[PDB]
Amino acid sequence: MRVVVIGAGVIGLSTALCIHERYHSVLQPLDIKVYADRFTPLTTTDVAAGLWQPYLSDPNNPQEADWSQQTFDYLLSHVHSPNAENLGLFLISGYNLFHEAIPDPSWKDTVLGFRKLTPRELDMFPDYGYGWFHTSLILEGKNYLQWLTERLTERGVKFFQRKVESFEEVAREGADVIVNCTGVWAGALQRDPLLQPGRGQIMKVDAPWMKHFILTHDPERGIYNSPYIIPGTQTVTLGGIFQLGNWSELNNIQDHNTIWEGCCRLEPTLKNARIIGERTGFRPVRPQIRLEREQLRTGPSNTEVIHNYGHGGYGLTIHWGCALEAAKLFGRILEEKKLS
Amino acid sequence: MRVVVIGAGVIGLSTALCIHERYHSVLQPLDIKVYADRFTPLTTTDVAAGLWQPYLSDPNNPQEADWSQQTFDYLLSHVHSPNAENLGLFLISGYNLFHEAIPDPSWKDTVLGFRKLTPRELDMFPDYGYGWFHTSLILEGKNYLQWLTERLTERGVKFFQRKVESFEEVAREGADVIVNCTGVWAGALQRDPLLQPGRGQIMKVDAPWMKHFILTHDPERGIYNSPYIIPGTQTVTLGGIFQLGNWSELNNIQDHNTIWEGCCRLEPTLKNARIIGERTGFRPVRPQIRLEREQLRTGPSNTEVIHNYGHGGYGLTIHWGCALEAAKLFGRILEEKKLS
Ligand SMILES: Cc1cc2nc3c(=O)[nH]c(=O)nc-3n(C[C@H](O)[C@H](O)[C@H](O)COP(=O)(O)OP(=O)(O)OC[C@H]3O[C@@H](n4cnc5c(N)ncnc54)[C@H](O)[C@@H]3O)c2cc1C
Numbered sequence: 001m002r003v004v005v006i007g008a009g010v011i012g013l014s015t016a017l018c019i020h021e022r023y024h025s026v027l028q029p030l031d032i033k034v035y036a037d038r039f040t041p042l043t044t045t046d047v048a049a050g051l052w053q054p055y056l057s058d059p060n061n062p063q064e065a066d067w068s069q070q071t072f073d074y075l076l077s078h079v080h081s082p083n084a085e086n087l088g089l090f091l092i093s094g095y096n097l098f099h100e101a102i103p104d105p106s107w108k109d110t111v112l113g114f115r116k117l118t119p120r121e122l123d124m125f126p127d128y129g130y131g132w133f134h135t136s137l138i139l140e141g142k143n144y145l146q147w148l149t150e151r152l153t154e155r156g157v158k159f160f161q162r163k164v165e166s167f168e169e170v171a172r173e174g175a176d177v178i179v180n181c182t183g184v185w186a187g188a189l190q191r192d193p194l195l196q197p198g199r200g201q202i203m204k205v206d207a208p209w210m211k212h213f214i215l216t217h218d219p220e221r222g223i224y225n226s227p228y229i230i231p232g233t234q235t236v237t238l239g240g241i242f243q244l245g246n247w248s249e250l251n252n253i254q255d256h257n258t259i260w261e262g263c264c265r266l267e268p269t270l271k272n273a274r275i276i277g278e279r280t281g282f283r284p285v286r287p288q289i290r291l292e293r294e295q296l297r298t299g300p301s302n303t304e305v306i307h308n309y310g311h312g313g314y315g316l317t318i319h320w321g322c323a324l325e326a327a328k329l330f331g332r333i334l335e336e337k338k339l340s
Numbered sequence: 341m342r343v344v345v346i347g348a349g350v351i352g353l354s355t356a357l358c359i360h361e362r363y364h365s366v367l368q369p370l371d372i373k374v375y376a377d378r379f380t381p382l383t384t385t386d387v388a389a390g391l392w393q394p395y396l397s398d399p400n401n402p403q404e405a406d407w408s409q410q411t412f413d414y415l416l417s418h419v420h421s422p423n424a425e426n427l428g429l430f431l432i433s434g435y436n437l438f439h440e441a442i443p444d445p446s447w448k449d450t451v452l453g454f455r456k457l458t459p460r461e462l463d464m465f466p467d468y469g470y471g472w473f474h475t476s477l478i479l480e481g482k483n484y485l486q487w488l489t490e491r492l493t494e495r496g497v498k499f500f501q502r503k504v505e506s507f508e509e510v511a512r513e514g515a516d517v518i519v520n521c522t523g524v525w526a527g528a529l530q531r532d533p534l535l536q537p538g539r540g541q542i543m544k545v546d547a548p549w550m551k552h553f554i555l556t557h558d559p560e561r562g563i564y565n566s567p568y569i570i571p572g573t574q575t576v577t578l579g580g581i582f583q584l585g586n587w588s589e590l591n592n593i594q595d596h597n598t599i600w601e602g603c604c605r606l607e608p609t610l611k612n613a614r615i616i617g618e619r620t621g622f623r624p625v626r627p628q629i630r631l632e633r634e635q636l637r638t639g640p641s642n643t644e645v646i647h648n649y650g651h652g653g654y655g656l657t658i659h660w661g662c663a664l665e666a667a668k669l670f671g672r673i674l675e676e677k678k679l680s
């Protein structure tokens with residue numbers, strides 16, 4: 001049984017790990033390879049601040065809500081493990097700010113100690129008059145991807161720096177199952193009009209007194225098109241750029257100023273923080289995640305493809321659930337081959 | 341009108357600032373000098389992490405409850421000021437962990453978003469079954485002391501490195517009012533049996549993923565004789581040593597281990613944190629702060645003395661109220677001399 005996983009992002013590696021943890025014992029020849037064009041720290045996952053929070057509105061597929069909750073419980077149960085430092089995982093609390101009162105999220109009971117903002121708390125943010133406060137988790141991709149890589153390598157999973165041209169290309173060379181975790185660039189392997197790039201830009205500043213995250217929201221501008229501040233381990237992430245359909249992997253001066261004046265007005269103490277870096281990424285935007293199988297009628301036989309892409313701006317938040325779901329789908333494939 | 345402030349701690353410097361802010365315009369000859377045996381970073385104020393939290397039990401003097409609340413409001417009104425980073429001031433949330441249920445604190449409404457710990461939150465800490473959660477302030481002493489110094493110097497307040505031997509020594513050289521902010525060493529100038537050293541020891545470690553404070557409580561051992569973790573700007577403070585009557589300004593290997601074993605069992609992720617430093621300090625313990633005037637019938641005339649010491653392990657937490665109160669006592673002195 002030869003499996004080929006396309007994509008070294010959080011979705012590809014975590015999926016590869018789950019599939020191995022669940023079926024390495026029950027498949028004698030379970031050979032898993034990872035074909036990826038870019039590896040950490042050159043993936044969209046590395047640019048993400050890594051905060052756990054789903055979109056404020058309920059998803060078109062309710063399974064995602066379960067996937068988010070499965071991931072949060074998974075990561076939380078290791079927030080205090082000895083190797084939590086290696087995963088880039090830790091607890092963090094912060095504010096969600098609005099202009100007008102809006103309805104509680106569906107994940108109010110997934111995060112810890114969710115509550116409305118006290119009037120005294122809203123006085124520190126004059127431009128906003130309503131919001132929440134809660135404790136959540138940050139899973140920094142740079143560390144998490146490197147941790148996943150060390151586990152896959154010690155499990156015999158080999159890695160190859162290689163751009164896949166088509167699914168048949170992999171099938172022809174012997175792959176039995178193709179796990180498509182190719183993110184925003186998925187259309188190049190099988191055209192998908194629902195997948196589009198949610199371009200984002202962030203800068204990382206040195207502001208170690210920042211102990212809370214501050215996510216601001218403006219329904220007119222769109223989600224994450226508003227200032228936000230997510231303290232990381234070594235640096236503080238400043239963001240608020242969400243440009244749909246822009247394929248420019250290049251830091252734009254205008255967005256730089258947008259991020260700066262927005263966060264400096266939200267946290268005036270930021271004016272005297274040194275800028276450490278700036279990066280751009282593409283949220284794999286899609287009306288809903290595409291986590292499903294597909295029988296590829298290519299060549300003499302059928303190669304089994306399982307898609308996992310289109311996680312938008314919550315890839316780190318749901319990655320575990322999607323991985324477990326993709327592992328299930330892999331299992332169902334084994335039963336149909338009658339080797340389970 | 342010559343004033344002399346003995347002590348360059350948080351109380352000595354903040355009091356010297358309040359006195360100048362209020363009476364530099366109504367006293368033509370207001371010449372203030374600061375006599376201190378040690379200056380930053382060699383004072384007890386430097387050893388303290390700087391967290392704002394009063395003792396859990398109500399104070400034997402109900403004024404201090406107002407002083408604590410005044411300082412908090414004051415500091416909170418500058419948390420987003422541009423020079424907040426200069427003061428070492430920033431918001432921070434955290435936990436107070438208890439083995440058993442205990443009554444709420446008097447300051448429950450001073451801090452932001454006070455609440456009890458959710459069952460899920462208490463599952464992170466097996467050794468504790470009840471606790472609080474709230475947002476508070478940290479005023480790092482090393483920065484705050486340096487900030488006060490810059491304000492006082494630019495106001496003409498001259499500093500001198502000098503060990504005062506007696507109140508009469510200062511009065512004989514021309515002092516009109518003496519502001520006694522000499523802290524735990526106050527006894528050497530006027531014997532006080534209620535003032536005793538609450539020796540403490542802390543170590544500062546590099547664990548930038550720590551975003552919350554974790555204060556442990558055990559009534560048997562006594563307050564602050566239990567593990568606590570307070571993330572600062574550049575480092576995390578690990579403490580839990582409160583030894584009454586110990587005058588040894590020396591790091592003790594036994595207290596080192598007690599601090600490490602305690603905090604590592606409280607936060608397992610700490611076992612892989614590099615130890616940056618270790619310091620010993622003496623809380624100026626007293627049944628209640630001594631903030632009062634006293635006519636010293638010394639020499640030909642009476643030199644006015646005003647005491648401000650005995651703040652124990654909450655100096656940073658009340659320092660501002662005490663400075664404002666010592667400014668009032670300075671005013672009444674101005675009225676009595678009939679130059680107000
Ligand atoms: C600015 C920004 C901030 C974000 N912050 C957060 C956050 O705080 N919390 C959160 O949960 N989410 C956040 N996100 C979203 C998150 O980054 C993404 O959802 C997640 O990184 C998606 O990962 P992925 O594995 O699907 O694709 P990405 O990690 O890109 O992985 C793509 C992988 O597929 C490979 N690949 C693609 N095509 C081929 C090919 N043809 N041949 C071989 N290999 C190929 C790529 O080279 C790479 O290996 C943020 C996104 C942005 C842009």
Ligand SMILES: Cc1cc2nc3c(=O)[nH]c(=O)nc-3n(C[C@H](O)[C@H](O)[C@H](O)COP(=O)(O)OP(=O)(O)OC[C@H]3O[C@@H](n4cnc5c(N)ncnc54)[C@H](O)[C@@H]3O)c2cc1C
Pocket residue numbers: 346347348349350351352375376377378379383384385386387388389390391392393502503504505521522523524525526528529539540541542579620621622623624649650651652653654655656657658
């Ligand atoms: C380990 C530890 C942690 C703490 N953490 C906190 C905390 O988190 N939050 C909080 O609010 N409080 C905390 N505290 C308590 C706080 O540190 C003290 O209450 C506060 O610093 C009191 O300082 P002070 O200005 O009164 O005197 P200290 O800063 O000692 O200063 C005394 C000053 O008087 C000078 N002086 C003394 N005698 C003479 C003399 N004879 N002649 C000339 N000068 C003299 C000294 O040299 C020094 O200049 C902590 C204390 C300890 C020990």
Ligand SMILES: O=C(O)c1ccc(Cl)s1
Pocket residue numbers: 049051052053054200224228239240241283313314
């Ligand atoms: O900018 C983004 O895409 C995001 C910010 C915070 C989360 Cl969570 S996603």
Ligand SMILES: O=C(O)c1ccc(Cl)s1
Pocket residue numbers: 390391392393394540564568579580581623653654
């Ligand atoms: O050890 C101490 O003296 C203190 C710890 C936390 C505050 Cl606040 S004081």
